[PDB]
Amino acid sequence: SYEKQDTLLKLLILSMAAVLSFSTRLFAVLRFESVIHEFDPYFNYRTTRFLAEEGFYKFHNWFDDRAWYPLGRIIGGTIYPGLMITSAAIYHVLHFFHITIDIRNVCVFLAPLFSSFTTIVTYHLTKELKDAGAGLLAAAMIAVVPGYISRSVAGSYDNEGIAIFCMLLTYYMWIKAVKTGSICWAAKCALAYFYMVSSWGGYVFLINLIPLHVLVLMLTGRFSHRIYVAYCTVYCLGTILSMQISFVGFQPVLSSEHMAAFGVFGLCQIHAFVDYLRSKLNPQQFEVLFRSVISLVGFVLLTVGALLMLTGKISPWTGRFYSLLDPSYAKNNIPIIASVSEHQPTTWSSYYFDLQLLVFMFPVGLYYCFSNLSDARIFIIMYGVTSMYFSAVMVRLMLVLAPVMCILSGIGVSQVLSTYMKNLDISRTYPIKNEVASGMILVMAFFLITYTFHSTWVTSEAYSSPSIVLSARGGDGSRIIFDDFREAYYWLRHNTPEDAKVMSWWDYGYQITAMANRTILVDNNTWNNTHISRVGQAMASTEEKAYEIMRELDVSYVLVIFGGLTGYSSDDINKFLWMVRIGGSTDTGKHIKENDYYTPTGEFRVDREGSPVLLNCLMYKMCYYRFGQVYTEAKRPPGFDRVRNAEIGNKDFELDVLEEAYTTEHWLVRIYKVKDLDNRGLSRT
Amino acid sequence: VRLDFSITKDPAAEARMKVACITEQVLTLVNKRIGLYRHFDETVNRYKQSRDISTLNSGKKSLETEHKALTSEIAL
């Protein structure tokens, strides 16, 4: 019976889409190992295994004295715990059945699971906007969309894996609320919002898009009681729920990031009440009260909306979010945020590379949403038009754009297919119209196939390489592997006193803390720029002066990463200029000037022409110790640097306050021991 | 699937559902009317093979009894 076949075909399509979504993310595990990638996921892993061992109340109170020595970090007060709670819950569920999976595997494979569930959430979210035939397309598109996979390959254990599931679930619940007008759906949307707020910092996007949608529905005059019930309930519940998270605190009430929602809430009340008085009074009896009441309550709001800002009692925009509103701010005001190349603006190339067909189909989904406007479709219009901008401001936010791009591309392709397939209803110029329809259907099938081959190629070649391991191919095409990062961290783990302090640049802090289990000075979450500057000043300063800082911070060891023997372009020598800038940024550092390290010509180089301060700083001396005598190549003189392509200028020297503790086989990682104070009170000169 | 969280019935959906059940029953009975005509056509083939009129007369009366019952149930 027709209903059975429609149900069968829906089920089969959706189960294939789920299996594809899960399976396409396994490339990284098949090529190397079921191990955690990148730097940032290691903090999530350590905290997750903590929560899985110590229990919730000891994780929430948790204070960590192994990081940011001697300051320490309040962990539970400065984290979004939803990812960890999810992983711990799944871990305890599986262990209850004695499916005693290792927690590392649960973390590694957590992202594919939710990236499978998001395909069903996207199906229902599109079905409620259009019809099931569009939801099947949006599911099949979001299954493989490379922009999302780029953040969701197995082992990419970071919040962005869960955040887009909570986001689409919140949009589904909000769309249901606005369509239906029911307090039940509003409270379920409030709970979905609370879940998302616990799990990613991007929640401010929803608590700023929903008010704008309601405002647009007011300006168009579509605002009707369903929207009042939905908005005021979602607002009160999601506010008092979001304020629960200790890292969020009072920000939902005391920060200008959320005042757009409060302003729309108050204006909803004013509109809901004017709509009632205008319904009770006669015009000649209405108008006087109407103009008077507006001339009082508007004046009140116009005053308070100024006083709140002028007093500074409502906190201004945070530099991050403001850098999202003004692309120029961070590059002048926070060099840490500038230094992360993930914050560069997005070129057309990355839009094509990550989306292909969707870039062509998105304007058609918009044309449909504008052709058949409705109270729910204005939401998708606003989401699309806002993500199209914010993705252009900063590549990292392409993640937020990929879902709406898939939903709108699915609507567009669905409308094309269901348009032309009606002309093929022969079964129950006409031959020209039929051959036109057949040709257009074939062109659409072809495009949709090319999108599969593109997305699979991109997923295989670009976004599936690890970063805790380096790979090369020998002349026989065998994979050469360099493990030197793990070799060095394991040497630290076993052959150094358990209370030793390792100084490093803040990139590697999560790796040292996770793999070496040693105390560190600075860390990726740059919550204390003064301390990072105090480390940069010690790296940039001269070897006589840096010792006073290393002995001030009680350092035991220092670690540097040197690529010059292997061509690893990401070494600490390339980071040196940022270390100089950050070290000179504090007032205690004003002797550190970037213009001192450049040659008089205005270039940075380490060969004989290099600045006589560059050739004498601590970092240069740590990187190129003994290196000057290594025959780096057959056609090159000794001391050739594979990355600068330059013969180093200062080849022979002695270190005086450091001794070489371990240099890895390929010299990729070098660790020095800071010499204890001279036994006789002699000076080291 | 057995439990129902409902409070107010909608007798219009109940009618839309009972009508569908009865229409599937009627469709089955009609498919059995076609199947009875296939039985009867087989009985005519058997008659041509046998030249025995009693076979086909009994076929006719079984048709005009069972098909008649199906017609009556259809009309009810």
């Binding site: 239906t180 007008g181 029911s182 307090i183 039940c184 509003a186 409270a187 409030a190 709970l191 009707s224 009681h225 369903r226 009042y228 019930v229 005021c232 309930t233 009160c236 519940l237 506010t239 008092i240 729920l241 304020m243 629960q244 009072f250 009430v253 009770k280 009074l281 009896q285 006087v288 009260l289 | 409070i7 107010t8």
Partner: protein
Amino acid sequence: SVVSVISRFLEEYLSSTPQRLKLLDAYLLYILLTGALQFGYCLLVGTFPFNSFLSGFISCVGSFILAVCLRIQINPQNKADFQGISPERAFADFLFASTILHLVVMNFVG
């Protein structure tokens, strides 16, 4: 004079309104007279402890809005707008949302 327009307001409202809606309009007045007085306290004695102030105040605003939503879902004049929702489902929803509210304010009162 505005007193006359107010008189022509109440002369209608008191005649036009079912008793189950006057009940709500008195409950809303109790809620509003509690919230306004909490506010007038907060800005007299001071913001500390902001936890408890903000919890009790949002509890008042929440109960007011949930009461207005009941006051609107049940109104027959809106049956053409909230299709598929019976008054009893609206009351079950009102108690669901009020249960979430009174749980979270009890998380935040302390």
